[PDB]
Amino acid sequence: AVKIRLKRMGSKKKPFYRIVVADSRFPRDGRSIETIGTYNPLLDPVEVKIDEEATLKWMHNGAKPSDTVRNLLSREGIMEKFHNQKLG
Amino acid sequence: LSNGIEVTAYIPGIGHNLQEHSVVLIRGGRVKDLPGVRYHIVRGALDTAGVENRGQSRSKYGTKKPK
Amino acid sequence: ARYTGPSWKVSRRLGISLSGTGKELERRPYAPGQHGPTQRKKISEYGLQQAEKQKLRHMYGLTERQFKNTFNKAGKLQGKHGENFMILLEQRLDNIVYRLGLARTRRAARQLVNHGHITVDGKRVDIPSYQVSVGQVISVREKSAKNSAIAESLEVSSFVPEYVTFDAETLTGSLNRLPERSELAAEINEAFIVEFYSR
RNA sequence: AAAGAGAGUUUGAUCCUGGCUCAGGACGAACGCUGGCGGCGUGCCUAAUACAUGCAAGUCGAACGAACGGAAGUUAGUGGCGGACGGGUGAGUAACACGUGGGCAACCUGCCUGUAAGUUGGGGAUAACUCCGGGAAACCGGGGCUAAUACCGAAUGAUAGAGUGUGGCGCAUGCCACGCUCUUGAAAGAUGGUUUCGGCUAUCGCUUACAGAUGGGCCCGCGGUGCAUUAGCUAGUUGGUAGGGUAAUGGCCUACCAAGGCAACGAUGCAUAGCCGACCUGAGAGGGUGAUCGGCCACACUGGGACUGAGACACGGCCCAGACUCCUACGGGAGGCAGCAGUAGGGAAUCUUCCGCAAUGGACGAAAGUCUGACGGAGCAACGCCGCGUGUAUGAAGAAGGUUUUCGGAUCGUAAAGUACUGUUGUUAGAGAAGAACAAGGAUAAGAGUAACUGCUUGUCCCUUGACGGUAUCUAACCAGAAAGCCACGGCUAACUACGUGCCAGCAGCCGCGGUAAUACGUAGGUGGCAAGCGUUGUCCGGAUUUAUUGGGCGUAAAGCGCGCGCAGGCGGUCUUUUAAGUCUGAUGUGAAAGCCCCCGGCUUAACCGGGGAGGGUCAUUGGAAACUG
Ligand SMILES: [Mg+2]
Ligand SMILES: [Mg+2]
Ligand SMILES: [Mg+2]
Ligand SMILES: [Mg+2]
Ligand SMILES: [Mg+2]
Ligand SMILES: [Mg+2]
Ligand SMILES: [Mg+2]
Ligand SMILES: [Mg+2]
Ligand SMILES: [Mg+2]
Ligand SMILES: [Mg+2]
Ligand SMILES: [Mg+2]
Ligand SMILES: [Mg+2]
Ligand SMILES: [Mg+2]
Ligand SMILES: [Mg+2]
Ligand SMILES: [Mg+2]
Ligand SMILES: [Mg+2]
Ligand SMILES: [Mg+2]
Ligand SMILES: [Mg+2]
Ligand SMILES: [Mg+2]
Ligand SMILES: [Mg+2]
Ligand SMILES: [Mg+2]
Ligand SMILES: [Mg+2]
Ligand SMILES: [Mg+2]
Ligand SMILES: [Mg+2]
Ligand SMILES: [Mg+2]
Ligand SMILES: [Mg+2]
Ligand SMILES: [Mg+2]
Ligand SMILES: [Mg+2]
Ligand SMILES: [Mg+2]
Ligand SMILES: [Mg+2]
Ligand SMILES: [Mg+2]
Ligand SMILES: [Mg+2]
Ligand SMILES: [Mg+2]
Ligand SMILES: [Mg+2]
Ligand SMILES: [Mg+2]
Ligand SMILES: [Mg+2]
Ligand SMILES: [Mg+2]
Ligand SMILES: [Mg+2]
Ligand SMILES: [Mg+2]
Numbered sequence: 010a011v012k013i014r015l016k017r018m019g020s021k022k023k024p025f026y027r028i029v030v031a032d033s034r035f036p037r038d039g040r041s042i043e044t045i046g047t048y049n050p051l052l053d054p055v056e057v058k059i060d061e062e063a064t065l066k067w068m069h070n071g072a073k074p075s076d077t078v079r080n081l082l083s084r085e086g087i088m089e090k091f092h093n094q095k096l097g
Numbered sequence: 098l099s100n101g102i103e104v105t106a107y108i109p110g111i112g113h114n115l116q117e118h119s120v121v122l123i124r125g126g127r128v129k130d131l132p133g134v135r136y137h138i139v140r141g142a143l144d145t146a147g148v149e150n151r152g153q154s155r156s157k158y159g160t161k162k163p164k
Numbered sequence: 165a166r167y168t169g170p171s172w173k174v175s176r177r178l179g180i181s182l183s184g185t186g187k188e189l190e191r192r193p194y195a196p197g198q199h200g201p202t203q204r205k206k207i208s209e210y211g212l213q214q215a216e217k218q219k220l221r222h223m224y225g226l227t228e229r230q231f232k233n234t235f236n237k238a239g240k241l242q243g244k245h246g247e248n249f250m251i252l253l254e255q256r257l258d259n260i261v262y263r264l265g266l267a268r269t270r271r272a273a274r275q276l277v278n279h280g281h282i283t284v285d286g287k288r289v290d291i292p293s294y295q296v297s298v299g300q301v302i303s304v305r306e307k308s309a310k311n312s313a314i315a316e317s318l319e320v321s322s323f324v325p326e327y328v329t330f331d332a333e334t335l336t337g338s339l340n341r342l343p344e345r346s347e348l349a350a351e352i353n354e355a356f357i358v359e360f361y362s363r
Numbered sequence: 364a365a366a367g368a369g370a371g372u373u374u375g376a377u378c379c380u381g382g383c384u385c386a387g388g389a390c391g392a393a394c395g396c397u398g399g400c401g402g403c404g405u406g407c408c409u410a411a412u413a414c415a416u417g418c419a420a421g422u423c424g425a426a427c428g429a430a431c432g433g434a435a436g437u438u439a440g441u442g443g444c445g446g447a448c449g450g451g452u453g454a455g456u457a458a459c460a461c462g463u464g465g466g467c468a469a470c471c472u473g474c475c476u477g478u479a480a481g482u483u484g485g486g487g488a489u490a491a492c493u494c495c496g497g498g499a500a501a502c503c504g505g506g507g508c509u510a511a512u513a514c515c516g517a518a519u520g521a522u523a524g525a526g527u528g529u530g531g532c533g534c535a536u537g538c539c540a541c542g543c544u545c546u547u548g549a550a551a552g553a554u555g556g557u558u559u560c561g562g563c564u565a566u567c568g569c570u571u572a573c574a575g576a577u578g579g580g581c582c583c584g585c586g587g588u589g590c591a592u593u594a595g596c597u598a599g600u601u602g603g604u605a606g607g608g609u610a611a612u613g614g615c616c617u618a619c620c621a622a623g624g625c626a627a628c629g630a631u632g633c634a635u636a637g638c639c640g641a642c643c644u645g646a647g648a649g650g651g652u653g654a655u656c657g658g659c660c661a662c663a664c665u666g667g668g669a670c671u672g673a674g675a676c677a678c679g680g681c682c683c684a685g686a687c688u689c690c691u692a693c694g695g696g697a698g699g700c701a702g703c704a705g706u707a708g709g710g711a712a713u714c715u716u717c718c719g720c721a722a723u724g725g726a727c728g729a730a731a732g733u734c735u736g737a738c739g740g741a742g743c744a745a746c747g748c749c750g751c752g753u754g755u756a757u758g759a760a761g762a763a764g765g766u767u768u769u770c771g772g773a774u775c776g777u778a779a780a781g782u783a784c785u786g787u788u789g790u791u792a793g794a795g796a797a798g799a800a801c802a803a804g805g806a807u808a809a810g811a812g813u814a815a816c817u818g819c820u821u822g823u824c825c826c827u828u829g830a831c832g833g834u835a836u837c838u839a840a841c842c843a844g845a846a847a848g849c850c851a852c853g854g855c856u857a858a859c860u861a862c863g864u865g866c867c868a869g870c871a872g873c874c875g876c877g878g879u880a881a882u883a884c885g886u887a888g889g890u891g892g893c894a895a896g897c898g899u900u901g902u903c904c905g906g907a908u909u910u911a912u913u914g915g916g917c918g919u920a921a922a923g924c925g926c927g928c929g930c931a932g933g934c935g936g937u938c939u940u941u942u943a944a945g946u947c948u949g950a951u952g953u954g955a956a957a958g959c960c961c962c963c964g965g966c967u968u969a970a971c972c973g974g975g976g977a978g979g980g981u982c983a984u985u986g987g988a989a990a991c992u993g
């Protein structure tokens with residue numbers, strides 16, 4: 010099913026993940042429906058930049074996150090807006 | 098040759114040691130005056146030995162550096 | 165450094181007084197070898213262009229691969245090509261230490277930079293090819309501070325170039341501004357090298 | 364803004380035409396001599412040849428039938444989901460295989476999300492187990508008894524089928540919405556809270572229907588190899604009428620009727636080749652290639668077939684036939700490295716039977732968790748691209764020694780010695796990151812739902828874990844001590860002398876050198892180029908305007924058919940009105956990510972990574988102009 014994965018990129022011992030919408034079956038760093046952010050684990054607070062409109066629509070019509078991606082990285086409050094929109 | 102083709106090579110340097118039924122490496126090239134010779138034998142490859150007491154231009158002819 | 169052979173011989177071959185002023189060519193200004201006091205012949209265009217390229221390369225004492233890489237990198241800047249090439253060659257951290265007067269020649273600033281004695285913006289750098297920019301500060305971080313070599317080099321000084329502001333009291337150096345082709349060696353011809361690398 | 368270098372060789376000498384050779388860039392390279400370190404990558408191009416051995420796909424006890432404990436909890440068997448993903452190779456294939464742009468009023472879609480109705484009652488039997496019958500043996504039958512979310516009916520329920528009625532429409536076959544009569548068409552329970560004792564309930568599962576998302580299938584325009592010393596090819600072939608089959612249109616298949624179809628704009632036949640984003644080269648137009656990284660296709664010892672499923676005619680599934688290998692008691696059995704390591708063989712040539720699920724992503728599960736040779740990391744190899752070492756400053760009309768000498772000297776050469784400094788690196792002793800935020804669990808706070816809790820959703824707090832690994836990094840002390848080679852020196856082409864040799868030995872990319880004075884052979888001295896590398900060979904582009912659109916020629920150098928009549932084709936005098944095929948132009952969609960290029964940023968710098976753009980189409984829909992061609 011459609012999920013929101015990470016798609017590791019970068020160099021050896023220095024990873025840098027994206028935030029993509031992909032169909033589970035396909036390879037990790039393979040084909041993906043759409044990219045909606047980045048994720049840098051190395052920095053003091055992690056620098057993450059996610060588009061709050063595309064992610065909300067994707068969650069609202071089927072896509073669901075994967076542990077670290079969004080479901081823990083949505084400290085921006087995207088999941089709160091999803092909560093409100095789903096009740097409202 | 099190992100692909101079923103018989104060619105004519107040339108032996109560079111001053112004094113070889115290879116006799117009949119010996120295995121060697123060959124490389125491209127040609128000797129202008131020699132009529133049919135159109136390859137060279139690599140020196141010091143498999144059973145060819147490097148030219149004796151060769152002092153300079155020594156990477157060719159396959160001679161080890163003196164001590 | 166990179167080439168550790170005698171230094172007078174290379175300046176005798178080229179015919180300029182690199183590595184200072186004239187002390188290499190005070191006696192016998194002719195080329196080395198059994199020959200050299202004999203004569204010279206008509207040097208073709210290949211000889212001339214190669215001579216100018218050797219003039220630049222042997223002045224800063226850097227290998228040919230690095231030289232060509234710096235040439236290609238300078239090619240991307242606006243304006244001319246030889247001017248930008250010499251500007252970038254002036255930007256190198258190894259050169260700037262020599263210009264401030266912390267060392268004597270090019271071959272001593274290189275060792276004094278690789279052995280960690282020089283820091284920029286408060287952090288050490290061990291790379292002589294680090295490209296300094298405007299506004300960064302150059303110091304010693306008391307890694308050596310009061311050592312015989314630096315103290316001696318601060319005595320013989322001539323005049324520091326105008327585009328570098330050096331504060332001898334704290335051993336703090338900077339780069340005021342980008343230089344211009346007028347205030348370089350000028351004992352070469354920068355136009356030849358572009359033609360040499362065009363072939 | 365971008366913008367192109369020539370040289371040697373035909374002659375006693377000239378000028379032209381003309382080939383040959385050299386100077387540059389790049390490798391998945393190999394061979395020769397050498398070889399210090401670090402970072403980032405790459406490594407069977409040949410036999411799609413043959414496999415010793417370890418692993419590479421399992422998981423659910425909260426769907427159901429036994430033993431240990433003494434009341435929890437743990438595995439063989441029935442069932443559910445997965446095994447069609449992830450990984451490998453380029454054999455086949457000249458065709459809707461691929462690229463780009465569209466159709467589908469001709470289609471399917473498990474799991475995921477939202478919504479609307481339900482989850483009512485019955486029946487029969489089989490694995491496991493127990494006996495007997497075979498076979499020492501792996502390797503099979505018969506008798507008897509058991510449970511379900513296994514299986515089979517029944518009650519109610521269709522926008523499914525039939526006969527309709529009524530509107531609104533399209534692009535011909537036709538599409539959307541509503542109503543009427545009938546016919547058929549299902550379900551499963553498990554873990555908890557609760558009242559009151561009946562039931563009523565929280566999730567997660569089951570059944571039917573409609574939307575969305577994702578993934579597939581079919582059809583079409585245009586584009587990209589050589590050969591005409593390969594001209595006809597085709598008989599379900601082309602069309603039509605009914606029917607069968609499929610999720611779906613269709614000669615996909617069948618019965619009948621007709622004689623069609625494709626082709627010098629290259630059919631047919633033969634040869635070779637997976638295709639693209641892209642890579643090397645070039646001033647550009649072009650030329651050559653399709654390693655690694657990403658997308659699609661095909662294949663899985665060779666050939667055929669189907670079953671199960673949402674999805675396969677299925678790498679680690681089944682059946683049959685063939686070659687090969689292995690057990691056999693002679694009735695018979697078993698296997699498929701083009702998965703990760705690895706062995707043999709072929710070759711001029713290519714790596715470890717390694718550690719771990721800690722990170723990211725898979726499968727199963729309510730969850731803890733289990734399995735992941737994917738992947739994260741480490742060993743091997745100068746195979747590449749970056750970076751810095753083997754010291755530094757002073758130091759003589761210039762030591763010793765080599766080489767040379769017209770015997771005064773010149774040279775190696777400030778090079779050495781001497782004096783004064785430094786620790787990148789090396790040695791030792793100390794410290795020592797990030798990559799890790801969760802999942803689970805425990806606290807509160809708020810919402811939806813309920814008669815009320817349990818639970819669900821969301822926020823805020825605790826709560827512990829690393830293969831790499833004592834690795835990266837940092838501190839302090841010690842010694843210039845351990846750490847330079849390869850090719851060339853006649854011209855092209857930067858850099859000359861001595862001795863030996865005597866058309867011999869030999870060198871050689873071309874001109875060509877060697878016949879007792881060789882700057883061309885061999886050594887020596889020093890000189891030049893590059894430097895942990897340096898040369899040779901092989902292959903591609905350039906220079907080559909040497910296939911010339913950009914950009915050549917045909918009187919005498921290669922090159923005008925011996926000449927005419929002419930089908931197809933190419934081109935076409937002057938003006939007006941008109942169209943809008945070519946032509947120019949605006950908007951909308953797209954031409955994925957990485958790669959080349961422009962601007963910023965992070966690794967001490969650089970290679971190397973990240974963020975933001977541009978560029979790329981004789982591309983589609985739509986709107987304009989009418990000078991030129993049609
Ligand atoms: Mg020598
Ligand atoms: Mg002639
Ligand atoms: Mg070449
Ligand atoms: Mg070694
Ligand atoms: Mg060694
Ligand atoms: Mg292969
Ligand atoms: Mg359990
Ligand atoms: Mg079990
Ligand atoms: Mg597969
Ligand atoms: Mg696959
Ligand atoms: Mg891969
Ligand atoms: Mg391929
Ligand atoms: Mg549902
Ligand atoms: Mg019963
Ligand atoms: Mg039985
Ligand atoms: Mg029973
Ligand atoms: Mg029924
Ligand atoms: Mg109906
Ligand atoms: Mg109507
Ligand atoms: Mg109770
Ligand atoms: Mg109670
Ligand atoms: Mg039909
Ligand atoms: Mg054909
Ligand atoms: Mg073939
Ligand atoms: Mg092939
Ligand atoms: Mg390449
Ligand atoms: Mg490449
Ligand atoms: Mg180019
Ligand atoms: Mg050209
Ligand atoms: Mg290849
Ligand atoms: Mg390969
Ligand atoms: Mg691979
Ligand atoms: Mg095989
Ligand atoms: Mg089926
Ligand atoms: Mg399989
Ligand atoms: Mg296998
Ligand atoms: Mg293998
Ligand atoms: Mg072994
Ligand atoms: Mg082997």
Ligand SMILES: [Mg+2]
Pocket residue numbers: 709710
């Ligand atoms: Mg072999």
Ligand SMILES: [Mg+2]
Pocket residue numbers: 720
């Ligand atoms: Mg894991």
Ligand SMILES: [Mg+2]
Pocket residue numbers: 731732
């Ligand atoms: Mg656990």
Ligand SMILES: [Mg+2]
Pocket residue numbers: none
């Ligand atoms: Mg296993």
Ligand SMILES: [Mg+2]
Pocket residue numbers: none
């Ligand atoms: Mg790996």
Ligand SMILES: [Mg+2]
Pocket residue numbers: none
């Ligand atoms: Mg080698």
Ligand SMILES: [Mg+2]
Pocket residue numbers: 406713746
């Ligand atoms: Mg290799």
Ligand SMILES: [Mg+2]
Pocket residue numbers: 755
């Ligand atoms: Mg010195």
Ligand SMILES: [Mg+2]
Pocket residue numbers: 760761
């Ligand atoms: Mg003297």
Ligand SMILES: [Mg+2]
Pocket residue numbers: 764
């Ligand atoms: Mg002497």
Ligand SMILES: [Mg+2]
Pocket residue numbers: none
């Ligand atoms: Mg150290």
Ligand SMILES: [Mg+2]
Pocket residue numbers: 800
């Ligand atoms: Mg944490």
Ligand SMILES: [Mg+2]
Pocket residue numbers: none
């Ligand atoms: Mg939790």
Ligand SMILES: [Mg+2]
Pocket residue numbers: 817
């Ligand atoms: Mg409670």
Ligand SMILES: [Mg+2]
Pocket residue numbers: 842
């Ligand atoms: Mg010392």
Ligand SMILES: [Mg+2]
Pocket residue numbers: none
């Ligand atoms: Mg010369």
